């Protein structure tokens, strides 16, 4: 059924699974028209499809052309997400196909179930985890490939860089969720934490800086401090 804190270790077992987050598929700016009505302008979006064990991220870029002349875009976005995840599964060799797809939003369950009828043994599950994958577009290299896209595109990333050489997938996923939660909560403060020391750079082939094990402990502590600082600001606590 639903994936929670109880069954957290299940994310890091040897059963292939993907998270799907659709929160950045349909993205708009809202503005006044000349007549003083309000209009939306779509911007490029993405499907965030992640294997939490390996770090492999299937970033399907959703180009604004897919919305042209379409109605009920927020509804269509869910079905387009399901169509693209289905197409990704069919593209993978059998031994690489997931046994489970965990959607971050319960509104994706029916669209994905209906697109995946041909795969009755792939479980489609919701989660009680509040995962900050909406903040993917705060990772500069992901935002850059999405905004520059002139057509539909799939780009493959490892969202853990080389961390799995040194840490477990449990710890890598914990680090990722903490960084994304910090970027979601105060983007400018989180990027300043990550970039403030100019001697630590991001490798051409990485998303995150090249922190030593001791520096990651410092960074993680600074991110927890940011989140707690912001909770205190929010609630006056």
């Amino acid at each position: 059924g639903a994936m929670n804190s109880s069954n957290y270790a299940e994310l890091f077992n040897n059963d292939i699974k993907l998270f799907v987050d659709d929160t950045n598929v349909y993205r708009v700016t809202v503005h006044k028209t000349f007549e003083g009505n309000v209009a939306t302008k779509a911007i490029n979006g993405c499907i965030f499809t992640l294997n939490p064990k390996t770090g492999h991220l299937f970033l399907k870029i959703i180009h604004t052309s897919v919305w042209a002349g379409q109605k009920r875009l927020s509804q269509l976005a869910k079905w387009k997400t399901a169509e693209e995840v289905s197409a990704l599964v069919r593209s993978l060799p059998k031994e690489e196909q997931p046994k489970q797809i965990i959607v971050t939003r319960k509104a994706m369950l029916d669209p994905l179930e209906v697109h995946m009828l041909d795969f009755p043994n792939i479980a489609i599950r919701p989660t009680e985890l509040r995962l900050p994958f909406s903040a993917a577009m705060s990772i500069d290299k992901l935002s850059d490939v999405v905004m520059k896209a002139t057509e539909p595109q799939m780009v493959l990333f490892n969202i853990y860089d080389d961390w799995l050489d040194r840490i477990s997938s449990y710890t890598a996923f914990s680090r990722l969720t903490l960084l994304l939660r910090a970027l979601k909560t105060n983007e400018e403060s989180a990027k300043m934490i990550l970039l403030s020391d100019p001697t630590i750079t991001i490798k051409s082939y990485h998303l995150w800086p090249s922190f030593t094990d001791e520096q990651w402990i410092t960074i993680e502590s600074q991110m927890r401090d940011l989140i707690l600082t912001e909770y205190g600001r929010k609630y006056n606590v």
Partner: protein, 300 residues
């Protein structure tokens, strides 16, 4: 007008005949039901006084044979049987009528209720849903499961309703996932009407039979099928106008006949609220909407 004699009534029982019901006492001199209107199917149903477990009964058409009821003390129920000997059957009915040992089917002349509830129901379609080819009548009870319930277990004692499943390859054309899931017209018109039922009369017959088995036996699978067949039409943007008008009449008489005190067990809130207020056909069921809002406004 036809007759179903009873050999005897050895156990106290509530006997239903269509929408009517009568209490018979243990060893009461009761010998059956006369004046049954020719031209409709009928159902004769039982609930024992000493064990309200198993409602059960028989669908029949007096045009198809001479039927009687006899209690079986081994299997503990009233069984329908066919009398093949015409002169014996006439002689038995004559004796019991002469002695006024039969209740009369209590039809009011102005009252079309039973026709309204069975307009599309045919014995030959009943005998394909309930498979016992050696009898011309069909046994149904409270506990019989449907082929659909059995998939999600004795296949011989099952109700073979047409399987309806909105999240199935049958319901959804590859490449038309959103279209077919949000608008069930493909599934209703191509798969179900053109493909399986051949016409709206057969589809409505099955819907009506499902409702009657839900109401008379408290058969849960039957209630599921009835609601699924309503939802499939209401969730279709493209439905022939005659079918919508006919569905409004069918549902009106079903909601009119439902016992007020069974509405909590016989009516699915989600389906009715969706069908009357959200669906493509929310504005197409004026008579059904009016009776539902006046009789069961708590459900809505």
């Amino acid at each position: 007008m036809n007759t179903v004699p009873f050999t005897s009534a050895p156990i106290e029982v509530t006997i239903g005949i269509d929408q009517y019901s009568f209490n018979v006492k243990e060893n009461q001199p009761f010998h059956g039901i006369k004046d049954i209107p020719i031209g409709h199917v009928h159902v004769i149903h039982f609930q024992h006084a000493d064990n309200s477990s198993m409602r059960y009964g028989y669908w029949f058409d007096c045009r198809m044979g001479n039927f009687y009821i006899q209690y079986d003390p081994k299997d503990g129920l009233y069984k329908m049987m066919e009398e093949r000997d015409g002169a014996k059957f006439e002689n038995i009915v004559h004796n019991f009528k002469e002695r006024q040992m039969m209740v009369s089917y209590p039809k009011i002349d102005e009252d079309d209720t039973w026709y309204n509830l069975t307009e599309f129901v045919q014995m030959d379609k009943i005998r394909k849903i309930v498979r016992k080819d050696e009898n011309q009548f069909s046994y149904v009870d409270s506990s019989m499961t449907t082929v659909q319930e059995n998939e999600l277990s004795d296949p011989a004692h099952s109700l073979n309703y047409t399987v309806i499943n909105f999240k199935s390859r049958e319901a959804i054309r590859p490449g038309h996932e959103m279209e077919d899931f949000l608008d069930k017209s493909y599934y209703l018109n191509t798969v179900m009407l053109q493909g399986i039922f051949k016409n709206s009369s057969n589809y409505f017959g099955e819907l009506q039979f499902a409702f009657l088995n839900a109401m008379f036996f408290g058969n849960y699978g039957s209630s599921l099928q009835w609601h699924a067949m309503i939802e499939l039409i209401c969730s279709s943007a493209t439905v022939p106008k005659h079918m919508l008008d006919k569905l409004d009449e069918i549902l009106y008489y079903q909601i009119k006949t439902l016992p007020e005190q069974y509405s909590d067990i016989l009516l699915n809130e989600r389906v009715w609220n969706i069908c009357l207020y959200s669906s493509f056909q929310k504005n197409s069921l004026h008579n059904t909407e009016k009776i539902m809002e006046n009789k069961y406004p708590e459900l809505l």
